[PDB]
Structure formats: structure tokens, C-alpha cells
Design an enzyme around this catalytic site. Structure first.
Site, mmCIF file in Angstrom:
data_model
loop_
_atom_site.group_PDB
_atom_site.id
_atom_site.type_symbol
_atom_site.label_atom_id
_atom_site.label_comp_id
_atom_site.label_asym_id
_atom_site.label_seq_id
_atom_site.Cartn_x
_atom_site.Cartn_y
_atom_site.Cartn_z
ATOM 1 N N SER A 64 6.755 -48.698 4.018
ATOM 2 C CA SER A 64 7.355 -47.945 2.916
ATOM 3 C C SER A 64 7.623 -48.770 1.663
ATOM 4 O O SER A 64 7.776 -48.188 0.577
ATOM 5 C CB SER A 64 8.675 -47.323 3.368
ATOM 6 O OG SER A 64 8.461 -45.991 3.731
ATOM 7 N N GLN A 120 6.738 -36.235 6.438
ATOM 8 C CA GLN A 120 5.299 -36.360 6.661
ATOM 9 C C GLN A 120 4.596 -35.034 6.386
ATOM 10 O O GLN A 120 5.212 -33.966 6.407
ATOM 11 C CB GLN A 120 4.981 -36.793 8.098
ATOM 12 C CG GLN A 120 5.809 -37.988 8.612
ATOM 13 C CD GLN A 120 5.407 -39.305 7.981
ATOM 14 O OE1 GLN A 120 4.483 -39.365 7.166
ATOM 15 N NE2 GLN A 120 6.103 -40.382 8.359
ATOM 16 N N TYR A 150 13.501 -37.445 1.355
ATOM 17 C CA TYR A 150 12.536 -38.538 1.394
ATOM 18 C C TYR A 150 11.221 -38.047 1.991
ATOM 19 O O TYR A 150 11.223 -37.350 3.002
ATOM 20 C CB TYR A 150 13.116 -39.682 2.233
ATOM 21 C CG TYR A 150 12.349 -40.983 2.190
ATOM 22 C CD1 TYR A 150 12.215 -41.686 1.009
ATOM 23 C CD2 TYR A 150 11.795 -41.524 3.345
ATOM 24 C CE1 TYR A 150 11.539 -42.892 0.965
ATOM 25 C CE2 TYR A 150 11.108 -42.729 3.312
ATOM 26 C CZ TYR A 150 10.985 -43.405 2.120
ATOM 27 O OH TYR A 150 10.313 -44.605 2.079
ATOM 28 N N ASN A 152 6.795 -38.759 2.202
ATOM 29 C CA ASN A 152 5.525 -39.427 1.945
ATOM 30 C C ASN A 152 4.527 -38.527 1.202
ATOM 31 O O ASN A 152 3.864 -39.003 0.262
ATOM 32 C CB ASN A 152 4.966 -39.933 3.284
ATOM 33 C CG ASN A 152 5.762 -41.115 3.818
ATOM 34 O OD1 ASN A 152 6.063 -42.047 3.078
ATOM 35 N ND2 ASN A 152 6.096 -41.088 5.100
#
Length: 359
Positions: A64, A120, A150, A152
Site C-alpha cells: 500500500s 477491493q 479506504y 484500492n
């Protein structure tokens, strides 16, 4: 070895070295940068099967912490006029025009506030084609811009747009523009064959070596690998951006501006930000399950804190990464390993080292 050399070695031996046996970690690199001087400590094995020891050439997966380079690339594109943070992604990825995701702007993607993107991609989204289909089919949930989760996919789309705005694939944005501008000579999205013998294996919880290519839009979220000397240079650039040429100096400063607040944490581009001094509890709380996994209401910033510090954890798996710096104290620290270590332990060890280093 200077008096500082000895003192810093001792502090790192006292606080980081025990983690190796405690968590069965094969290899670790820990560095401190202070007043333009680097202090580098290497322990253990780069590769267990090869009995290759960690050294100054060892290349580690950043996990990360890769997002800090995505953030810098975005600050670079914005300060060159290639994007505006008020733009939406369909301005650059034309197949997203006239779809709901084209109502989210780039800063909101970069700082995880789209209101409907999780940590994800769904398990079924495995190819580049499926990622585009995923974003064309996307619909908002929570008020756009108001909640942090948070994600990705969120910063991956931001990085894809940054690359489109510079007319290069994302790997080339880093390897041909951002890494050379920062003076990094052994940092990579794709490790070249002449460097494979320096590339550390990641080790899973069963201590088996694991290497995988990134998933779709994975490189902006977790795709960078680097050495300890390179990461110390990167922290130096964040501590003293005024010493770098204007285009990268402006990029770096862009990653330092707080964008909103969640309790005691201020979200910048990539970096998490805190009022200095931050208590140990404040730093630990930034990595609570609540902050890491849940949607949290953001609040606009009144004025930024007067004295700041910054960190980022590089969770993922098969690697542990932690970076922190304090401009007031002209100091920073980098930890790289080839096996996961609880974030709690990384923060505590760095806190103890940084609180003890004499000015």
C-alpha cells in the site's frame, strides 16, 4: 561510525530487531534519515531458499505504500496543468462519459470519498475489460464526497486517469517521469531481469515464497518495489521539497495538503497527516479496524494544523512497510520487510525510535 551511527543502530536493534524472531520474518531493512544523513540497518535473508542476505541493493515490495507514488504522480500532473482535481474521470477515460462514476471528481477518487467503493474490486473483476465494465455499471450510494472508505479501486482509477492525462501507461509515468525526478535509481513497477537476483521474495503466513503480477488497475494501489536507500531519498524529498526542481517540488507539496479530517487524522494525497506531536494512541487509532474498513464521515478542514507529521502503512501481505516523517524535526524513518508484521508493532517501534533520537 559517528556517535549518531552507534546511537541509532542501538535504538533500531532494541525496537525493530526483536520483531524478526517474534513474527518469524526472514528479512528486514530499517532506515533513518536526519538532517540529510542516512542510517541504514539490514537484518536477515532476502531469500531463504537462496541464503541471500538483505543488503542495500535488496528490492522489497512496498504494498500500500505504493499509493504515495501514485499521489506524487497526481500532484505532478495537476501542477503541470494536465489535470484539475475538479475534473471527472470521463474527461480522460472517454468510455466513462455519461455514466454515474463521471459524477465523482479526481480528488474524491484519490482520497476515497466516492461513496460506493470498497477495499477491493469484487472477486469476479479480474481483467482490464472487466474493470471498465465495473466502472461503467457503477452507481453511487452514500453522498459523493462525504464518507471515507479506504479503497484500492478508488485510487487505481485515479492513477489510470493520471496516466491517461500524461499520454503514457502508468508504469511509464513512474519509471520514466516520477522516479527519475526524485533521484530514485532502483525503484520499479516492473523489476528488470538484471535486477531479479536483488528482488526479495514475499513470504506468506506459512513461510512460503510468493510472487504475483498485479491485478487489473493494481499498480497504482500496490505495484511499486524499492530499496531502502531509494526510500530514504524519497523521505528526504518529502522533508526538503524546496531543494528539488519546481515540477517535482510542486508535486511533493501537493501531497502534503490536508483535504479533510476524520477525528484526529487529516487525509492528504496518499499521506495520512497528524498534528505534531501525535500521541501513540492517535497514531494507533489511524490504523483501527474502524478507520481501515468502515465508511467514516469526513469534515471540512477549518485551518490545517500548524505543525504536522505524516505516515503511511503498507499493510497488504507478503510484506510489511512503514514510512513516517516529521518536518519540524528534519527526521524520518522507513521499515521494509518480506513478511507481514502487525501494523500496531510497526507504529510502536517507530514511535520509540523517533522519540529517542537526539536532535
Amino acid at each position: 561510525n559517528t556517535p549518531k551511527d552507534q546511537e541509532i543502530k542501538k535504538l533500531v536493534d532494541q525496537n525493530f530487531k526483536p520483531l524478526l524472531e517474534k513474527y518469524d520474518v526472514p528479512g528486514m531493512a530499517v532506515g533513518v534519515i536526519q538532517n540529510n544523513k542516512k542510517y541504514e540497518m539490514y537484518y536477515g535473508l532476502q531469500s531463504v531458499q537462496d541464503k541471500k542476505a538483505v543488503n542495500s541493493s535488496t528490492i522489497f515490495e512496498l504494498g500500500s505504500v505504493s499509493k504515495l507514488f501514485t499521489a506524487t504522480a497526481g500532484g505532478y500532473a495537476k501542477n503541470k496543468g494536465k489535470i484539475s482535481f475538479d475534473d471527472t474521470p470521463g474527461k480522460y477515460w472517454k468510455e466513462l462519459k455519461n455514466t454515474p462514476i463521471d459524477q465523482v471528481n479526481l480528488l474524491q477518487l484519490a482520497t476515497y470519498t466516492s461513496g460506493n467503493l470498497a477495499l477491493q474490486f469484487p472477486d469476479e473483476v479480474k481483467t482490464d475489460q472487466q474493470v471498465l465494465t465495473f466502472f461503467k455499471d457503477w452507481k453511487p450510494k452514500n453522498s459523493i464526497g462525504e464518507y471515507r472508505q479506504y479503497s484500492n479501486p478508488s485510487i487505481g482509477l485515479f492513477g489510470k486517469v493520471v496516466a491517461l492525462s500524461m499520454n503514457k501507461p502508468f508504469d511509464q509515468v513512474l519509471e520514466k517521469t516520477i522516479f527519475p525526478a526524485l533521484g530514485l535509481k532502483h525503484s520499479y513497477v516492473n523489476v528488470p531481469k538484471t535486477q531479479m537476483q536483488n528482488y526479495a521474495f514475499g513470504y506468506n503466513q506459512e513461510n512460503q515464497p510468493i510472487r504475483v503480477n498485479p491485478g487489473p488497475l493494481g499498480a497504482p494501489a500496490y505495484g511499486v518495489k524499492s530499496t531502502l536507500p531509494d526510500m530514504l531519498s524519497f523521505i528526504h524529498a518529502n522533508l526538503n521539497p524546496q531543494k528539488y526542481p519546481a515540477d517535482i517540488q510542486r508535486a511533493i507539496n501537493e501531497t502534503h495538503q490536508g483535504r479533510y479530517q476524520v477525528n484526529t487524522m487529516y487525509q492528504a494525497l496518499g499521506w495520512e497527516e497528524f498534528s505534531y506531536p501525535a500521541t501513540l494512541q492517535t497514531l494507533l487509532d489511524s490504523n483501527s479496524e474502524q478507520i481501515f474498513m468502515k465508511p467514516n464521515k469526513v469534515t471540512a478542514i477549518s485551518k490545517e494544523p500548524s505543525v504536522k507529521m505524516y505516515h503511511k502503512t503498507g499493510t497488504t501481505n507478503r510484506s510489511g512497510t512503514y514510512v513516517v516523517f516529521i518536518p519540524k524535526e528534519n527526521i524520518g524513518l522507513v521499515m521494509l520487510t518480506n513478511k507481514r508484521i502487525p501494523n500496531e508493532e510497526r507504529i510502536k517501534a517507530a514511535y520509540a525510535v523517533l522519540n529517542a533520537i537526539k536532535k
